[PDB]
UniProtKB/Swiss-Prot annotation:
Coiled-coil segments on the chain, per record: none
Function: May be required for packaging pre-mRNAs into ribonucleoprotein structures amenable to efficient nuclear RNA processing. Binds to poly(A)+ RNA. Appears to act in the maintenance of CLN3 mRNA levels.
Name of the molecule in the record: Nuclear polyadenylated RNA-binding protein 3
Taxonomic lineage of the native organism: Eukaryota, Fungi, Dikarya, Ascomycota, Saccharomycotina
Domain RRM: 3-74
Compartments in which it is found: Nucleus, Nucleoplasm
Organism domain of life: Eukaryota
Length: 77
């Protein structure tokens, strides 16, 4: 499937597709990248795999102007 992962304040160190692929590979099933600014977006396979990625690698709760994440899904086809 397709799915959507959002990150703030973590992807500020240098990153390319393999870096996020290997750090998230055991947490979730992954698809494609889109990173810019003090933030980064990654499309994934499966939305449970999205929430296990940012809630176990980043943090299981957000904090204003300090650590931001989001889980997001979409309709198939």
């Amino acid at each position: 499937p397709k799915s959507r992962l959002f990150i703030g304040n973590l992807p500020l160190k240098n990153v390319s597709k393999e870096d996020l692929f290997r750090i998230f590979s055991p947490y979730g099933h992954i698809m494609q990248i889109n990173i810019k600014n003090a933030f980064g977006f990654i499309q994934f396979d499966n939305p449970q795999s999205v929430r296990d990625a940012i809630e176990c690698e980043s943090q299981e709760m957000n904090f204003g102007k300090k650590l931001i994440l989001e889980v997001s899904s979409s309709n198939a086809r």
